[PDB]
Amino acid sequence: VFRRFVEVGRVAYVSFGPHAGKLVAIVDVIDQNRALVDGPCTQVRRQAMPFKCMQLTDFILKFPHSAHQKYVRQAWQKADINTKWAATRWAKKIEARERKAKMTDFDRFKVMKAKKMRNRIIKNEVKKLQKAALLKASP
Amino acid sequence: SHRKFSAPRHGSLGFLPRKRSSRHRGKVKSFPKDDPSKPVHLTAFLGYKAGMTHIVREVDRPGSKVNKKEVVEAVTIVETPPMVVVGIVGYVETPRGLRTFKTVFAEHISDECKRRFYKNWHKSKKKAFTKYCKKWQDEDGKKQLEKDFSSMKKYCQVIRVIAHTQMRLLPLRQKKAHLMEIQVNGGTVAEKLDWARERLEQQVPVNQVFGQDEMIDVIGVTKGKGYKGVTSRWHTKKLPRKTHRGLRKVACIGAWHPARVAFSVARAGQKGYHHRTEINKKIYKIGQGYLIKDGKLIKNNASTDYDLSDKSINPLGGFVHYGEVTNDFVMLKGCVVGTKKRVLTLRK
Amino acid sequence: SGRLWSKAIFAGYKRGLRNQREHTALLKIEGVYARDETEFYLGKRCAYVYKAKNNTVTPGGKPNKTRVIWGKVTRAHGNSGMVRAKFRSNLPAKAIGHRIRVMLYPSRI
Amino acid sequence: MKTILSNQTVDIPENVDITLKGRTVIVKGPRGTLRRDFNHINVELSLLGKKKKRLRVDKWWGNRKELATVRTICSHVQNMIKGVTLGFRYKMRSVYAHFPINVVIQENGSLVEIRNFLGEKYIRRVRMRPGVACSVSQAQKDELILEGNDIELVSNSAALIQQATTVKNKDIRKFLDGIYVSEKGTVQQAD
Amino acid sequence: QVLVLDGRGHLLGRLAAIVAKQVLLGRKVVVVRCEGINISGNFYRNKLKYLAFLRKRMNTNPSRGPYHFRAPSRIFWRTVRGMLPHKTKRGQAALDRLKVFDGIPPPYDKKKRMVVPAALKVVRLKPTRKFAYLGRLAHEVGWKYQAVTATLEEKRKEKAKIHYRKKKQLMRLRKQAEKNVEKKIDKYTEVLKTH
RNA sequence: AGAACUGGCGCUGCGGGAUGAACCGAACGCCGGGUUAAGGCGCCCGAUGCCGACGCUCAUCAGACCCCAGAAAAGGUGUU
RNA sequence: CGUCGCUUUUUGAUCCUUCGAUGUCGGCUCUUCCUAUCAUUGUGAAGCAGAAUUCGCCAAGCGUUGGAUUGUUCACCCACU
RNA sequence: CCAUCUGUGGGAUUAUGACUGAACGCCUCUAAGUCAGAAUCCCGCCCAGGCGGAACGAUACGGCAGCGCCGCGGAGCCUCGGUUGGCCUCGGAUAGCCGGUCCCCGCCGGGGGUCCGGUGCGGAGUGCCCUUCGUCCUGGGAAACGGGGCGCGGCCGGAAAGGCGGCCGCCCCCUCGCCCGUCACGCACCGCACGUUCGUGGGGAACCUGGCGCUAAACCAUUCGUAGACGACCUGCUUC
């Protein structure tokens, strides 16, 4: 229980505020409800974001306790976070979530035609697994 | 203010609508709630009180000063001919109380029964249940009549039995059956119901439901006293002699500042014919009366182990304003609600 | 084939606390729930559709039992994102809780 | 203050092993089992390590009145572990004046019928919580022994006797009668 | 058309505020299983301030005057009647839409219930503080049909667990059906466009 | 009960104070737009349906907005 | 010796309302309500050995009478409980 | 009360008393947790039963009428609201859901490994019909159910408001019900509002209209008096 903490060097997501959507790295905590973040390769500079603003990931880093901006920058890209943040099944969730809103209206038509084709195939094939689950036990 | 001498209440607020009951038969408010650990039986029963006599018993109460001595005690004897079970009703509870699930009547119904379902027997063509008895007889409804038992047994929770008096055996003018709906407190609800399936249109005496010295309750409708004012209805004090505008009133019927007459205060209205429920009457003697025809008529009632005369419980020349008791009876210690010639329902 | 408007329940009149102003309505339209995204709905032509006993037909041909009261969106109203409106008649005051029809008209897109 | 964290450490001996379905604690030992659920208290329980079974209940932020209850967790768990390896023997000793109190047990070691307390005609049925045991001590006058695993239910059992034999409307400084508890011990003595 | 509110886990006024506005907008709400409605504060305080309500009685006949209901069906209902302008006809007609029900009735058991996260016990109380049930205090005041609803709470929950048995059985195969062939020409337009 | 200075009701609506002569705003032809005042923004009731910020407080009689419609001495290992 | 209050069951202070009238002492009759409890239940404290009394808490469900004098509210007295 | 008869127990707790036990290494009835607990409090018992609801019975001929249930299309009158529906785990929130062996409940569901997922993607910010102009001509991919219905009849399922859901066996008939394309037509109504549904909605009146049935009652006058100020109630009436 409580599998991921806050810590000097925890990569944190930031869902809202004036810095919505980008990652940070906790540099030091100040007074329980707020903390000091910065990000070198994610374009958010060094400031104090509150904890109810942010959003924790799994990625810890190895920092000295509240070092300068350069010592975040190396250990960021020595860890290569944006690659390890790319192929996760949570950044695919936010990126899918933002694909669908900007979907142009012709692209809504292409989805609508080609969604029901795989519904008129899966529904017409899971009905046969209903047929084959009872021809088995027909004796 | 501050009365200067405390007085108790006159009357009871627990019986506050001093008002004619909506009914003539004593409706049972709450049958004793069934525990299925007991063998299967009834609770309630219909009977007509006739009059009162008295008794002499050898009291037996070790610890009292009355003991080992003759006591006269007031009894009341109640003529109870046997009932006939006609219908079964199952109830299922909801979160809004018990709801009447469905009914089943008898195969064929008697003559005084159908007279209850009409307000005028003469003008009517006596047509009740004449399109109901075909579905016991023809097979078309008959397989869906046992559907109505199969769905009875699973869902309903307390079953009650529609039975009524026999008026042919009673010396009155009335000849309408008093139809009731009485609860079986039997075992499991299949066998609570498999006892009443046996016995539609079959007679039931009182000595199966009740026994000797079983202490029962009486539910019935009180005296018709009329429309009587304050000091008679509520037994408030008469005013002193000097009083202008009346000896027999209550005087002060409220304060000022509640500018509104309270309900608590006594005032004129309708005295009697209320519904009441007497508690803890003792049965003394279950009676059987006027047996078979070979011994052409043996009467033999009013027979203790010490008087021992071929007598009859009705007095020398019939009861006053009743008639003549010919049937099974119940006799009960004390005074019991209701005028003579009036139905009252008994209850364990 | 197809519906071409937005469902919009009719919330009240632009009231103070005691007296109310009949000359402007206000509409909570279904879908917007903030002031940030009410900028689409400004200046849209909206209409209250109801029934009568008499027959008349504005468009088409054959008359019928249907008549309409026009109107248009004026401006936003409160951070909840409901919208004050301003019809060319005043409202029947039956319409409280009923919806109206808010079109896809007068586009700036 | 909202202190960061507080934590006690609870050791478990090797003949008893603790499993949890969440906040609920299931303890099984040599002489049976007993369980306590802490579904209201909002503190995580953490088992850690094989072969040794260190328990470490730790509470985060908290106000001080919720900080105070984490010691109550380890002081209730260490009366199940002791209660499932030893159990609690309660020795209540009857004191009486001129009337000797006489006492029996009818139902299997669970019901106690007390008579002639101070000179009454009235007997007292003190029915115990299900899970404890009666014992009249021999090789000793009028000593009553109560056993069982769970220290609540054994002491709830031992309270309903001490509270039933109470002298009313009198001096209770003098008129000292009753069935007073005297010693709460172990069943397996010194193990 | 109609929305259905599962009633358990909520607070009383923090739910009944939201219903009182949504019923003034011409909608139709049905609150279902209003027995497990909570109320903040400890229990004995919430039992004092309802016995304090029962001593309110007009001293010339109580048969007119404050009608103290007892069932938690009609306790949540009299709260919402407090928050609608019932003395005018616009507030009379905002009670022809709310139909509170206790337990889960058979017209309303086979619908997908909706809950309010704006009113829950998890969200709105601080977790270290004490909370009552609307059910068991209505057991304390007169609503004597408690167990014969908890008898029917399980008898609905029995037949609902056997639906979830076979809804996932009618869902376990369509994951096995999509492990078959020739659909990935139509996964191509959806993985690109939020499947 | 009686005064002094100045304002106010009387003679005067309206917004707010639940309600009211006198408080707080503010003074009036009839109207359409826009904005604020005192005030308010769970729902009656227009408006926080803000991812509002920081700490305090649990009552078995909680507390909850000038005049204003109920309180003191004294006390508490209830909590900061 | 002090000192802080509550209460409107006592009088007094004030004149706000009523002078084209609000029928004004006391008793008799009846209902309700408060609790600052005399009794009854649960209880705690004593200069509580028991009995008998006394102090506080929870508590208004139910009780709190019969008379001599007085026109009386009050007062006083016998008797009961 | 001047004669007699009867008068009803369950629960949550107050005060006080304890338990377990921290705060504060002990202690402590409390901070969390529990226990006993009474003329108070609520309920039952007891009295009335509402602009509340059931179940069930009986449902109007004579001489011509007349009335239900089912099948009807024709016209007219009135009331209006809506514009696709989601067919259901339990609960937890200092925690949770998925799929899955071992040993258990009459060949399913129950307990433990282990494996996934987790700011919920087996995600009501989601899902499925779908935004379906219609049709022809024609070719590729998907397809062996055909699917509406006057169906025909059977079956059990769901009582807390069952008014609701599936299956089987035949059948006028469909072999064009969907995706990707070939080809060409229908009011293409000359820029413009109330269009698109629900729904052959809810109401009551009458005519041409098939098949099935249906032959009552209440109230009053009359009588009684278990009852009554008048109404109300209680009863009676057979040509035996």
Short mmCIF file of N, CA, C and O in Angstrom, two decimals, chain B residues 304-344:
data_model
loop_
_atom_site.label_atom_id
_atom_site.label_comp_id
_atom_site.label_asym_id
_atom_site.label_seq_id
_atom_site.Cartn_x
_atom_site.Cartn_y
_atom_site.Cartn_z
N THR B 304 -72.49 -29.93 36.26
CA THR B 304 -71.17 -29.99 36.87
C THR B 304 -70.90 -31.43 37.31
O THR B 304 -71.58 -32.37 36.90
N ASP B 305 -69.89 -31.61 38.13
CA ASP B 305 -69.69 -32.88 38.80
C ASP B 305 -70.42 -32.97 40.12
O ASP B 305 -70.28 -33.96 40.84
N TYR B 306 -71.21 -31.95 40.47
CA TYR B 306 -71.83 -31.90 41.79
C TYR B 306 -73.30 -31.52 41.78
O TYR B 306 -73.97 -31.73 42.80
N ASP B 307 -73.82 -30.96 40.69
CA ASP B 307 -75.25 -30.67 40.61
C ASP B 307 -75.99 -31.81 39.94
O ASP B 307 -77.00 -32.29 40.47
N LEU B 308 -75.52 -32.22 38.76
CA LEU B 308 -75.77 -33.55 38.18
C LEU B 308 -77.23 -33.78 37.81
O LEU B 308 -77.80 -34.83 38.11
N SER B 309 -77.84 -32.79 37.16
CA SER B 309 -79.24 -32.88 36.74
C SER B 309 -79.35 -32.66 35.23
O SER B 309 -78.65 -31.83 34.65
N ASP B 310 -80.27 -33.41 34.61
CA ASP B 310 -80.48 -33.39 33.16
C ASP B 310 -81.17 -32.08 32.82
O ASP B 310 -82.40 -31.99 32.69
N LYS B 311 -80.36 -31.03 32.69
CA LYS B 311 -80.79 -29.65 32.66
C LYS B 311 -80.45 -29.07 31.28
O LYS B 311 -80.09 -29.80 30.35
N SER B 312 -80.59 -27.76 31.14
CA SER B 312 -80.15 -27.03 29.97
C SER B 312 -79.71 -25.64 30.40
O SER B 312 -80.26 -25.08 31.35
N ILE B 313 -78.71 -25.08 29.71
CA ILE B 313 -78.05 -23.88 30.21
C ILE B 313 -78.92 -22.64 30.04
O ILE B 313 -78.80 -21.70 30.83
N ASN B 314 -79.83 -22.63 29.07
CA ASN B 314 -80.76 -21.53 28.96
C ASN B 314 -81.70 -21.54 30.17
O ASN B 314 -82.03 -22.60 30.69
N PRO B 315 -82.08 -20.37 30.68
CA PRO B 315 -82.83 -20.33 31.93
C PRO B 315 -84.26 -20.80 31.77
O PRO B 315 -84.72 -21.11 30.66
N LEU B 316 -84.99 -20.85 32.88
CA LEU B 316 -86.33 -21.41 32.93
C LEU B 316 -87.29 -20.50 32.19
O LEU B 316 -87.92 -19.62 32.78
N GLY B 317 -87.39 -20.68 30.89
CA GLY B 317 -88.19 -19.83 30.05
C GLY B 317 -87.42 -18.97 29.06
O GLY B 317 -87.92 -17.90 28.69
N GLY B 318 -86.23 -19.39 28.64
CA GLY B 318 -85.47 -18.68 27.62
C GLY B 318 -84.75 -17.45 28.12
O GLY B 318 -85.18 -16.82 29.09
N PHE B 319 -83.65 -17.10 27.46
CA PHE B 319 -82.93 -15.88 27.78
C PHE B 319 -83.76 -14.65 27.42
O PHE B 319 -84.62 -14.69 26.54
N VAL B 320 -83.49 -13.55 28.12
CA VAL B 320 -84.21 -12.31 27.89
C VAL B 320 -83.63 -11.63 26.65
O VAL B 320 -82.42 -11.43 26.56
N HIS B 321 -84.50 -11.32 25.70
CA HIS B 321 -84.18 -10.65 24.43
C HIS B 321 -83.15 -11.39 23.61
O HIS B 321 -82.44 -10.78 22.81
N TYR B 322 -83.03 -12.70 23.79
CA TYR B 322 -82.14 -13.46 22.94
C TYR B 322 -82.88 -14.49 22.10
O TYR B 322 -82.83 -14.43 20.87
N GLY B 323 -83.58 -15.41 22.73
CA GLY B 323 -84.02 -16.58 22.02
C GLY B 323 -83.79 -17.79 22.88
O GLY B 323 -84.13 -17.77 24.07
N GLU B 324 -83.19 -18.83 22.32
CA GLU B 324 -83.05 -20.08 23.05
C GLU B 324 -81.81 -20.80 22.56
O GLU B 324 -81.69 -21.10 21.37
N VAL B 325 -80.87 -21.06 23.47
CA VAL B 325 -79.55 -21.55 23.09
C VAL B 325 -79.62 -23.03 22.76
O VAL B 325 -79.94 -23.86 23.62
N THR B 326 -79.32 -23.37 21.51
CA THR B 326 -79.42 -24.74 21.05
C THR B 326 -78.08 -25.35 20.66
O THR B 326 -78.03 -26.56 20.40
N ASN B 327 -77.01 -24.59 20.64
CA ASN B 327 -75.80 -25.00 19.96
C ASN B 327 -74.65 -25.17 20.94
O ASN B 327 -74.83 -25.19 22.16
N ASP B 328 -73.45 -25.35 20.38
CA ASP B 328 -72.25 -25.31 21.19
C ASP B 328 -72.09 -23.91 21.77
O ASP B 328 -72.49 -22.92 21.15
N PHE B 329 -71.53 -23.82 22.96
CA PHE B 329 -71.35 -22.51 23.53
C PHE B 329 -69.98 -22.37 24.17
O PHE B 329 -69.22 -23.33 24.30
N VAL B 330 -69.68 -21.13 24.53
CA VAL B 330 -68.49 -20.73 25.28
C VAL B 330 -68.98 -19.90 26.45
O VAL B 330 -69.81 -19.01 26.25
N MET B 331 -68.50 -20.18 27.65
CA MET B 331 -68.84 -19.35 28.79
C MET B 331 -67.59 -18.76 29.43
O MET B 331 -66.56 -19.43 29.56
N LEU B 332 -67.68 -17.49 29.78
CA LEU B 332 -66.52 -16.64 30.04
C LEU B 332 -66.73 -15.88 31.34
O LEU B 332 -67.82 -15.40 31.60
N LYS B 333 -65.67 -15.75 32.13
CA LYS B 333 -65.76 -15.03 33.40
C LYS B 333 -66.00 -13.55 33.14
O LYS B 333 -65.18 -12.89 32.51
N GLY B 334 -67.11 -13.04 33.64
CA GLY B 334 -67.27 -11.61 33.79
C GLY B 334 -68.21 -11.01 32.76
O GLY B 334 -68.99 -11.70 32.10
N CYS B 335 -68.13 -9.70 32.66
CA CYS B 335 -68.90 -8.95 31.69
C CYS B 335 -68.09 -8.71 30.43
O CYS B 335 -66.88 -8.47 30.49
N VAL B 336 -68.77 -8.77 29.29
CA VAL B 336 -68.14 -8.77 27.97
C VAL B 336 -68.88 -7.77 27.10
O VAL B 336 -70.10 -7.61 27.24
N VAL B 337 -68.12 -7.04 26.27
CA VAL B 337 -68.61 -5.95 25.42
C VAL B 337 -69.79 -6.39 24.57
O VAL B 337 -69.76 -7.44 23.94
N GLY B 338 -70.85 -5.59 24.60
CA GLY B 338 -71.85 -5.69 23.57
C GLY B 338 -73.21 -6.01 24.11
O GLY B 338 -73.33 -6.67 25.14
N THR B 339 -74.24 -5.57 23.40
CA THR B 339 -75.61 -5.89 23.79
C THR B 339 -75.89 -7.36 23.55
O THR B 339 -75.08 -8.11 23.01
N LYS B 340 -77.08 -7.78 23.95
CA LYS B 340 -77.51 -9.10 23.58
C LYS B 340 -77.85 -9.10 22.10
O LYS B 340 -78.10 -8.04 21.51
N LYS B 341 -77.85 -10.30 21.49
CA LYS B 341 -78.01 -10.50 20.05
C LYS B 341 -76.98 -9.71 19.25
O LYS B 341 -77.32 -8.97 18.33
N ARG B 342 -75.70 -9.83 19.61
CA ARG B 342 -74.68 -9.09 18.88
C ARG B 342 -73.41 -9.89 18.75
O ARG B 342 -72.89 -10.41 19.74
N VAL B 343 -72.89 -9.94 17.52
CA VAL B 343 -71.73 -10.75 17.17
C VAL B 343 -70.48 -10.20 17.84
O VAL B 343 -70.24 -8.99 17.85
N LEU B 344 -69.66 -11.09 18.38
CA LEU B 344 -68.38 -10.66 18.92
C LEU B 344 -67.34 -11.73 18.65
O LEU B 344 -67.62 -12.92 18.75
#
